[PDB]
Amino acid sequence: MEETFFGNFDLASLSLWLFYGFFALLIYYLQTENMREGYPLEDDDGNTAANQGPFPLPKEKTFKLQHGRGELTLPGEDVQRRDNLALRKTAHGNGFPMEPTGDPMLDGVGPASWSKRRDVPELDAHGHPKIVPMSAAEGFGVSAGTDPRGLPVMAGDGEIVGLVSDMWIDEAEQLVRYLEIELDPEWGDGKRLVQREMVRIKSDRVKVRSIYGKHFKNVPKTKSPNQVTLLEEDKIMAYYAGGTLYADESRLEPQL
Amino acid sequence: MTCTITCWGIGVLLGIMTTVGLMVVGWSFLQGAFMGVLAWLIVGGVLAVAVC
Amino acid sequence: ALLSFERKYRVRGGTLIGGDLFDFWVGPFYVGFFGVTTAFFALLGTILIFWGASQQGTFNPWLINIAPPDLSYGLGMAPLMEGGLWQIITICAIGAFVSWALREVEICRKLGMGYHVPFAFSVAIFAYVTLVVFRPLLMGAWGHGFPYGIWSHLDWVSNTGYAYLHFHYNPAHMIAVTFFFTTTLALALHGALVLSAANPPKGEEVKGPDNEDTFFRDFIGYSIGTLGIHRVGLLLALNAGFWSAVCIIISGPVWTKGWPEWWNWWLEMPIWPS
Amino acid sequence: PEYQNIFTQVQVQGPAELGVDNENNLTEERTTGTGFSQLIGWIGNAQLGPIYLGWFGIISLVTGTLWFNIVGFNMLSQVGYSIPEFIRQLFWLALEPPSPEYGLRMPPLDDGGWFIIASFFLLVSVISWWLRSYQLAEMHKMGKHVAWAFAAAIWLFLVLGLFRPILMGSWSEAVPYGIFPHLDWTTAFSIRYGNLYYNPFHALSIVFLYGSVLLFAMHGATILAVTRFGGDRELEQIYDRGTASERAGLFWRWTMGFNATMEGIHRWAWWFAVLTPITGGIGILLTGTVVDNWFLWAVEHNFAPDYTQDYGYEAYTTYDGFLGR
Amino acid sequence: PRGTGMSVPEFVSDLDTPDPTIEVFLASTSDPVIPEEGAQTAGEAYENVDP
Amino acid sequence: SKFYKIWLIFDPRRVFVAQGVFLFLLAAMIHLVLLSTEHFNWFELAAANAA
Amino acid sequence: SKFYKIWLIFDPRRVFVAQGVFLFLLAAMIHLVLLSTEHFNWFELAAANAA
Amino acid sequence: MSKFYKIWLIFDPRRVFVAQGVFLFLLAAMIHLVLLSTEHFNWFELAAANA
Amino acid sequence: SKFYKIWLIFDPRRVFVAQGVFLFLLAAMIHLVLLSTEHFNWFELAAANAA
Amino acid sequence: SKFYKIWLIFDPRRVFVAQGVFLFLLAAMIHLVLLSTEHFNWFELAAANAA
Amino acid sequence: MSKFYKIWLIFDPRRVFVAQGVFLFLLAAMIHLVLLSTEHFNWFELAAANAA
């Protein structure tokens, strides 16, 4: 207690070193638990990298997915990998950026890149699709803020492409996830979705600064107008953010 | 918003006025500020609820 | 190396002042124009710290102490071994921190994600900036910055804390601390929510957002939501960093007296029946 | 500028969401009344949900109010039931722990006897609330991470007022129940036992407390940065990761050389938060009981810095020079 | 020592303002009068003078 | 008179609890005010009366 | 003479609640400031009268 | 006068009884603590006073 | 003479509430100003006039 | 002469609210700074004029 | 003088007017208060000196 053993190493020192050993084990546990995705490492050529780091991959853990979606083991065989990427290396070595072969936004390679998620809509606790248009919502309505329905949509370059037809809401958590854009015949056809986190709503109009007017006709569509699958949901969101770098050369080129 | 933001703006203007109004008749800046802050919470909340 | 999905995101572009000249990766790190300046400033600042440690006479990490000059030197440059080295390391630290934040802008611009992280880091930079260059200017002496030591800068906090007579009564420190405790409280509960939902007892299905949303509805009667917690949590942490900047920037150049005596306005009001 | 997802630009309200429920049948003890607030909806969910009226929660609420009231009426009795003085001195009044000359023995009511009664009710309320968190996670078939994270806060809570006073030989080591008084206790505790800066476990707790705020600014901004990719839906990103998890990981892999998963982030988030009171609880528990002077502990363990300059103002200036005369 | 926040912050205006009672003392004080040989004391000049 | 029409506006189950907490809080506050004054503190008067 | 139609724009239950809170708060505030002055503090006058 | 039984037509017996039980005990505890505070009515201490 | 058209611009309910609380706050502020001064503070004047 | 075109670009309800708050704050500020001066203070003047 | 109407094609009349409207008042108020700051052009204290 108040007396020391082998030198100045008292009980406070013993507790301090005991925590040091525990923390080292904790850091190993914490770091390994983050290796369940994206591992093993690879090089720019796609082969397995010679170096895998100082932390070995953890034991396989299983998630009992709900709504009868089977099980899920994270370490090994990521099903979200995209096969045909439209990129080729700018250098024969490693550590250098890729240059898209074709249209970066259409192919979805850079900031426009999506992930091969499940081709099924996300489900709430009831088993119903999580994101649905507010028209199909039972008793939902705008409670505060500016209602964007009917407001014209202004692209990044200022072009007016159409008016908002509906908002795809998240009835499980009661928030807006998308805005439906009814494209004018000049700027495209059909309807397209833009995520709420990428859109800015003004008093009279609603604007997206990430995508120019000519790129709305190429926004990924949804197979059904009543629900969106995670694959389409990932493609749609990625496309708009891809325009933050690919709408024009001025965004990709250095700003100074 | 709009109405609520404007009502809050009326309160902070009233809070500033009460901050200097009590300073004129004495008090101090910190004592006046507390009444000004208190006024902003009270009349600002009341206006944002009743007017809007 | 690269992750299993990193190849696609490694595209050229999204640079502020640099171009393809610095647009490359070194290992996992991304080098840019500001990654070049970060590497230069961080290495120069780190080496000068050990150079000062060599001249200080000790290499013990606990005992290494690079201190600002005397208050008699004012805002001018001091001799290198008399405090001038601390000023240069401060200049290197500001360059390293600003470039690191600007590099993070290049990282997120290349990935198409928002600029929230570099902005959030800039608040922490502002807390350091207000501690080392803003407060000394308001006092007219570089000697008011904290020394660059593991335990020496703890002595500075202790001495500065008691230099205002029971710093606990500082109103901005009172606000800043309760943001620090709430952020840790929010971090624990939010981290627990996701882990609990994702890791149920063995033989039970994983819980979706609805199950974790209703847990605090049954726990504390209101749940801020999956999206709400991240934005309120960022503001909780940024307020903690911002109010920490306030509590130290109002200490010397605003309230030279004791901090309990600041509360004399509450104790002495006309409303109170003395 | 681009829309930063700090405040929602439009919010919708539908039928109130009661809960998920299962064969554990939580509905009977769940309230049937909910409300909606648009002011809080600008930053989070706008629904004021229904309390689950469990017995652990009710006991915690009733006994917690008993501790709150007992401290309150002693505070009101401090100033002789003078409400204007009670309001004026609200931040200064407290229910002081017993005098040190009583030890673990029960002290008189005016000299900490009501402190023990209030502390006992506070202990019951705090423990009952933890049992509520454990039971609620059990009834929801969820992980007990909330209960374990709370239990870490109980550790420092129990060390501060229960564990340390028991093995310090006196109830006087407990923390007074006051706004400013427990700040005075916090400062006096560091002064009495040297300097808690030089307590390694206090330093360790500070490391995790800064790290906890650091992570949750990192995590809060990173998720808001990938919220354009549905990053706020963390749970679905754990089961089926999209570009939100990948971009968030690659942002920090390209910045600091390594990253986390959408699930592994919360393990990092959980542990620094949990380690903050665990390390602090250890440091307080062995402060005074083991080490009675932390600076002297630092001196003998060679991590207290030494200064070669003079300690007097006369060595740097003069009184006339400071006054400008 | 430089480094550690051992300092006493004071406003320049406060430092420039002296103690208001200093000028009061200067108006009241006076130079002492050096006694000479065989100088009369307070006991002789006035009665009921304390020792 | 015709004051009974107030119940056509006020909800009886929401105003009865409103005055129920209000009346007790008013009663408790006034009792505390009397205890604060040394003239009307019947507890201290009993001690003084006994002497 | 034609003030009856104020309720055409004011909701009774919405203004009655505000009026009830306002009247009690005003009455308490006037009572409180009246207790602040020593001339109208009926508690101290009772103490002084019996002294 | 005798129509007080109609209070149960507004208040359900379950919620009022639970509120009543907590209120009465807290009121009883509040008053007992007040007497324990006063030196004249502290029956525990005056027992020690009587030898 | 044609000021009646202001209600075509201002909503009656929104503006009546706005000036309803503006008048009371103004009246209270002006009254509280008279408390601050010594010549027009009727509380001290009543005490002074009562000797 | 063509000043009436200002309403073609300004919303009458938006400017009037801004005009109303500006005029009162301007009037209050001018009144307040007037009270700060000793010369233009009708409250202090009346006390001085009376005695 | 009268031929400079081509500039108005660039500005939104609402934006420029409110910007210049608050600019003139802020500039006028700032000029008035610095006149109050000086000991020679402060017309409030000049009346006090004149009226003794």
Ligand SMILES: CCCCCCCCCCCCCCCCCC(=O)OC[C@H](COP(=O)([O-])OCC(O)COP(=O)([O-])OC[C@@H](COC(=O)CCCCCCCCCCCCCCCCC)OC(=O)CCCCCCCCCCCCCCCCC)OC(=O)CCCCCCCCCCCCCCCCC
């Ligand atoms: C160019 C110049 C630029 C500027 C330079 C100048 C900068 C000045 C400051 C310099 C600071 C150091 C620089 C950072 C290191 C750089 C390394 C690098 O770039 O390449 C990494 C290199 C790999 O090459 P690579 O380029 O990354 O290629 C990809 C990998 O192959 C693929 O593998 P991977 O996917 O797994 O990723 C690899 C990753 C894997 O590593 C990790 O997973 C990191 C996870 C742990 C970090 C989180 C811990 C922090 C939490 C709080 C810590 C503070 C409290 C701790 C103390 C109190 C509690 C005890 O490694 C890293 O990325 C390193 C990140 C930085 C490491 C942490 C930085 C130090 C933190 C502590 C501060 C110390 C003060 C500064 C040092 C003093 C310098 C003078 O080698 C390493 O991986 C380093 C090993 C990792 C460290 C061991 C951590 C495991 C902990 C368990 C053992 C702990 C024992 C202690 C307890 C004893 C028990 C009794």
Ligand code: BCL
């Ligand atoms: C006697 C002492 C007084 C006292 C006096 C002070 C003083 C004096 C100060 C504080 C300040 C703080 N006090 Mg206090 N305080 C006291 C008691 C407390 C208590 C408590 C439980 O008792 C608490 C919780 C706090 C809490 C705090 C926080 C509000 C704040 C800490 C700094 C911060 O926010 O980050 C701010 C700092 C930064 C964010 C650092 C930025 C980091 C940079 C950008 C990145 C670093 C990179 C670096 C190179 C590392 C890289 C190396 C490796 C490669 C990774 N105080 C005691 C009573 N307190 C400090 C403050 O506010 O600072 C603003 C301050 O100066």
Ligand code: BCL
């Ligand atoms: C002069 C002051 C001393 C000081 C003395 C202390 C003391 C004394 C302590 C700390 C401790 C702490 N100090 Mg220190 N500390 C100082 C300077 C600092 C500085 C700084 C920049 O200067 C900082 C950042 C810190 C930081 C910290 C944290 C790391 C740590 C507390 C973590 C915590 O919240 O636990 C979380 C736990 C709690 C706060 C209590 C948990 C509460 C319970 C669980 C909840 C009950 C709720 C209650 C019933 C109310 C409910 C009401 C609801 C509304 C319904 N200290 C100086 C040296 N410091 C603590 C420690 O040592 O940790 C090892 C501690 O005891």
Ligand SMILES: CC[C@H]1c2cc3[nH]c4c(c3C)C(=O)[C@H](C(=O)OC)c4c3nc(cc4[nH]c(cc(n2)[C@@H]1C)c(C(C)=O)c4C)[C@@H](C)[C@@H]3CCC(=O)OC/C=C(\C)CCC[C@H](C)CCC[C@H](C)CCCC(C)C
């Ligand atoms: C500012 C608001 C809060 C916050 C946020 C925050 N911090 C951040 C970020 C964010 C959002 C990042 O994105 C960024 C990051 O990438 O973290 C991993 C970061 C960061 N904040 C960090 C640390 C940190 N954050 C802290 C706190 C906080 N984090 C605040 C509470 C603290 C405290 C107060 O204890 C520390 C120590 C780093 C991990 C990282 C910044 C990395 C960086 O700047 O890298 C470039 C520089 C180097 C590699 C070395 C530079 C060396 C210098 C040239 C010389 C030495 C200077 C220094 C002043 C000496 C110190 C001596 C002694 C006092 C130790």
Ligand SMILES: CC[C@H]1c2cc3[nH]c4c(c3C)C(=O)[C@H](C(=O)OC)c4c3nc(cc4[nH]c(cc(n2)[C@@H]1C)c(C(C)=O)c4C)[C@@H](C)[C@@H]3CCC(=O)OC/C=C(\C)CCC[C@H](C)CCC[C@H](C)CCCC(C)C
């Ligand atoms: C991991 C460490 C961090 C942490 C975590 C943490 N805290 C937690 C949890 C977790 C994980 C919970 O699950 C739990 C919780 O439910 O949070 C919402 C909690 C909690 N930690 C809390 C506070 C808290 N946490 C703190 C800090 C921390 N806890 C650390 C930073 C601090 C500090 C040190 O400053 C405090 C003060 C609470 C919000 C909550 C614990 C509450 C609980 O469950 O029981 C406590 C008691 C009551 C609920 C009863 C109180 C009595 C009344 C409600 C008050 C009076 C009401 C009214 C005035 C009555 C009037 C009556 C008269 C009119 C008659």
Ligand SMILES: COC1=C(OC)C(=O)C(C/C=C(/C)CC/C=C(\C)CC/C=C(/C)CC/C=C(\C)CC/C=C(/C)CC/C=C(\C)CC/C=C(\C)CC/C=C(\C)CC/C=C(\C)CCC=C(C)C)=C(C)C1=O
């Ligand atoms: C859900 O979403 C999320 C994720 O999951 C998708 C995440 O993961 C994260 C990230 C958060 C995590 C918790 C993940 C794990 C991370 C941590 C535990 C750390 C964060 C917590 C802390 C308490 C901070 C601890 C700090 C650490 C670990 C240090 C990291 C910071 C540093 C500054 C050190 C690393 C930097 C280095 C080494 C320098 C950078 C390099 C350059 C700029 C390159 C420059 C090069 C040149 C110019 C060329 C010269 C080349 C040379 C000299 C060759 C040398 C080579 C080298 C490699 C050095 C978040 C927020 C998130 O929300």
Ligand SMILES: COC(C)(C)C(=O)/C=C/C(C)=C/C=C/C(C)=C/C=C/C(C)=C/C=C\C=C(C)\C=C\C=C(/C)CC/C=C(\C)CCC=C(C)C
């Ligand atoms: C209108 O309102 C009325 C009605 C007037 C009213 O009431 C208002 C109430 C008002 C104003 C009171 C407001 C309370 C305030 C400001 C106090 C803050 C409180 C703070 C800061 C707490 C710090 C210290 C906490 C610890 C650290 C405890 C440690 C507890 C330990 C762990 C308990 C351990 C148990 C025992 C020792 C018992 C042992 C015995 C047995 C087991 C038998």
Ligand SMILES: [Fe+3]
């Ligand atoms: Fe999260």
